[PDB]
Amino acid sequence: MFVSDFRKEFYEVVQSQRVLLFVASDVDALCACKILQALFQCDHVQYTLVPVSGWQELETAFLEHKEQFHYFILINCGANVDLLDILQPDEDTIFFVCDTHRPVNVVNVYNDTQIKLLIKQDDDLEVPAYEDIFRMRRRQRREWEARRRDILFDYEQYEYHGTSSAMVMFELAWMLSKDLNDMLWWAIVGLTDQWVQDKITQMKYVTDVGVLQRHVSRHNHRNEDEENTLSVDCTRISFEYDLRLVLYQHWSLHDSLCNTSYTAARFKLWSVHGQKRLQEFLADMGLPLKQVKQKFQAMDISLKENLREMIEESANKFGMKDMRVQTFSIHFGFKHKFLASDVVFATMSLMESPEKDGSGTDHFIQALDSLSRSNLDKLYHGLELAKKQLRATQQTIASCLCTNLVISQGPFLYCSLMEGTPDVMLFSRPASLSLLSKHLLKSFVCSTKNRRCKLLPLVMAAPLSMEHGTVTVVGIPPETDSSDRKNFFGRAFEKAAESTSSRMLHNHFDLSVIELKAEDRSKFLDALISLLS
Amino acid sequence: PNALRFHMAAEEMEWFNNYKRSLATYMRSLGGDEGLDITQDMKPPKSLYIEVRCLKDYGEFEVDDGTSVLLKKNSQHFLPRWKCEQLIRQGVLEHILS
Amino acid sequence: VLTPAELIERLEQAWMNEKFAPELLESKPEIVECVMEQLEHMEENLRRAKREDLKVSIHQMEMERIRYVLSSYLRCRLMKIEKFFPHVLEKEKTRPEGEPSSLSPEELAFAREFMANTESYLKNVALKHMPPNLQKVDLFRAVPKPDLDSYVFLRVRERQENILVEPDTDEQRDYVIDLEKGSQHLIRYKTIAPLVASGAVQLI
Amino acid sequence: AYFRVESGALGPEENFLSLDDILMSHEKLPVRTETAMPRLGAFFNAVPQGSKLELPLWLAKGLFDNKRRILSVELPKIYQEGWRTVFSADPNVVDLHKMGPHFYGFGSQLLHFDSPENADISQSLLQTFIGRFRRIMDSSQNAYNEDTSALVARLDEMERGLFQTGQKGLNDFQCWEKGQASQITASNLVQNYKKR
Amino acid sequence: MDAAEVEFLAEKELVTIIPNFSLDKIYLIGGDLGPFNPGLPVEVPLWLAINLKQRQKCRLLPPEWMDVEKLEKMRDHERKEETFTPMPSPYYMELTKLLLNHASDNIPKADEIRTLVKDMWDTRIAKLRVSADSFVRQQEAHAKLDNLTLMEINTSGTFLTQALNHMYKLRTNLQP
8 A cells, every 4th residue: 555644654653663674776775775764863763774686685685584573664676566475474564665666566556454655646656446456257257357457467568767765755854854954965866866877757857856956945045144154064955057977077078078978979989080070079169178188177267167058059059959957966075066966976886886806785885885974985986986887888889889789670679798898797787787778779879870770679688697608688668858768678578588488587676677598598589579579 | 712712721711711700700799780791881972872784694683682683794783882882892793883 | 978960970080080090099889889879770760761752862871971980980990900919909908997998898809819810820830830949929029019100190179288299319309389279280199199099189 | 901011120120020121131231250150161161250251131130249249240332431422412313222122121220230330321311311202202293194114213112112102192182083983893902813 | 091081071061952842851860951942942961962963853052152252362362371271161172073063053153163273272282292391301390280171181191191200210210
């Protein structure tokens, strides 16, 4: 069932008990966990926090803890599956679920006692009515069964994402009157994480930006003398109309332009004429080459006065109309200034680090620590890692596009990474592969001639384990400016594997990421083709 | 730890056991019941509760007589300080400040 | 009878005095017993209160502070006892009836056990295998005594007059000073130890 | 919670259980033998009267008596007028680490032999300490998170103890001001056992 | 004594807070803490004030002496004089650190206050250094240090006392 009053049905219920937190491995989940942790530590709530990265890890942890706890909170996991079947709990256990994944499983929606969903009812949710899915025989009973099959298939075809969990937690904090500035920053970072990964549409992002703008004004608006007397060490959050360039304040403008998928795709910098086009762009700006190649902080201040406006104008002349995005920045001290997307990229790079000296639960701990202002060194280290990852992404995209590795089957495009690829190791982890596939599709759509291939979704495969011969397979929908961001590849994959009898594993919390036995791969794909054409 | 026990001579182990017994007796004699265990409270207290991260697998750990919690690596717990001080001093838990 | 606040004040005073004195100071059984009893009563009273209260948490924090101070004080005394055990025991053995003791009965039992344990270990490990006339080690001479010529910082609680400062062995160099209430001095402990005993000065 | 027995070499007698004092008294000292010493010739068979030997300070202290029956003691060159004059010029430039690690402790124990130069040895040891105090205090209390190998190179054992105390005071305040003094941490011994 | 213990002592000083909760009078062993009423000021020990602030239950009020004009006068006076001048609090450094680290949002002009307190601390530390050098160089047996706070003494006390112990032993070598 859905929770109406977060204060009375969830927080007051849990305040007096011991609770177990299962936190998934994404930035939005980390920010939601941060907000909830602050709330719990304010009220002396005894909690245990367990990082989980997949279904097997969650099941193992629940088996380990089911005896010692009665209240569980799942952050960004558990909403799209029948939880009571996967976990097989006791009748007295209660599961609070704060998950962004959609659609919500019908069994979770219609449970009265054990499943409580911390999901806003104003979201995009069209749940089938209870009668049609739960309950002369040929005339009615068989007709009802066939109708249920049809409605359930239609309802569970596309996967998408709802409101950020960090924003839900911030709404809870505001209801309790315990909302601080750090909590608001965490909510902003969660929404920006949703945006950076194309999990939500542009309209939803702008709406939520306005919602957060109101809170920012309420928290940070003061008169002139109040600003004068306020210490520089107190955090300040500001709304900004800033540039799409990635990490440009912690890098050089040239490096940022070369390693941002937006500009890199539109300039075709993987080509030989793309560099000349970039030079023409910079000449149109009037920025000396030696200045744009210098680190942004060291660049002469006179060039920074109107940088955003001039970049917007030049980009408009060059066919880029979306150079400017509404976002937020945080300042503290004399030195420390960050845009939201910079924090998102740093956290992602800390979490998906290729340094295997440390495990993934170890990489999760680093990422969670970096979100606290006491661990600022971790945030700067993550910024450096993000720079390396962006360079690797652009190199891989260039290698894929120059060699014509993106081949169109009938209904979808297929690109496969090989072990001979230099940076393949950086993209073996599923999240990195998903982000790479999205960036690659954007570049390909910008740089292709065939009109049909521009309207196709993408399926991408990369090696996972050379011992078991397993390959990670990801599927993403077509890249369009007004895309609903809805994905049909999870059900398609499950239907292809069933029809062909391949050995597939669903461990990611997203159903569009799968593990496949390499030998079955070929076979699998044909079924998929026949299924989508 | 057995590693440390290895270096000691047998007579040194006997001395250590005798000293341990004497210290336990003295600590028991201070108060009405159970006395006061002055091996705890080694630093001035700041907060009633603290956040701890498990640095190694340790298994069941009793919070109250009724309830215990499983210590597994890289899990985090919000617990009273007086129940975690000893395991922190032994290198089993780490104190997280945020 | 002291008020509880005054009791905590004296606990802190003894804590700091023991922390900076070079020797074992006088035992304070009344302070320790009263503080332990106060903690027990407060624990009992909180047992009657509801768990969710802010008041319970505040009371627990205060009890934690008091417990820390008492534990640190007792640890300091135990360290001094272990460091100087033969001399502590010798002083206790020959104490006049009127003069106050530097050991509580429990500390005395602990010290006696410490001495016996260490002596038995030394005898059983090495000394019994040495030549017959080298088998006795006089622990009274082997263990160093407290150095009472240490320099300390003190704050004056009650005015004192005609304190004799002796810079060296020569008498002609010695002079006299006054200690005013609230003033702070740096001086050798031997000169002012009775004032620490009586409470006229506080070691900082 | 581990505190070794402290040195008592500056006092009238050294501490029986002090490792530093045992090492200090291991050091040699020239002597002249005032009586034939039978059955010990192998180690230096008799040792003839008037022979010149170098003995450990503990052995010289054991055999010495005020009337000079068994042996007479001569001061090491470091404590004689030639070096005392060098110390007076500028005590900050002399390397007391190479000229006996326990320079003060050894010189203090030399006063037991009742030399005619006792007042001069005593006065020299005091002035050397006074003349070196300011540099020791400044270097110890102001060298933060830096290499100190060049700052303690010329200090003797007693001075190196003071330097360590000064560094401890500086470090504690810096930790407190930076907010690191409130975290509960693994004990020092545990850190040196399980992570070293 | 270490710095954490001096801070523990400093935490017993009284400050004023405005709570956002209601509570009856608390009978602590240390002493009564008056009734708490939302919006009204009340005096509590610094440790409880910091704890309540960290739990979002109160707003702190700067002490009377934490004023820029007064602090500037005090710093100038400290720089003009030769000895230590009387300080507004016996734990001014610790109180400043705790209050400004945890409640800068409640204390206007916190940066100026921190800088002035730092100036005073530096001047007094230099005076203490001069005192120690004079003690050793002139071979004193006693000294007077009035208006010096516990944290200031503790910053270099152990070193100075150990040096003085060694120097005394060297001064009393010849006595049989």
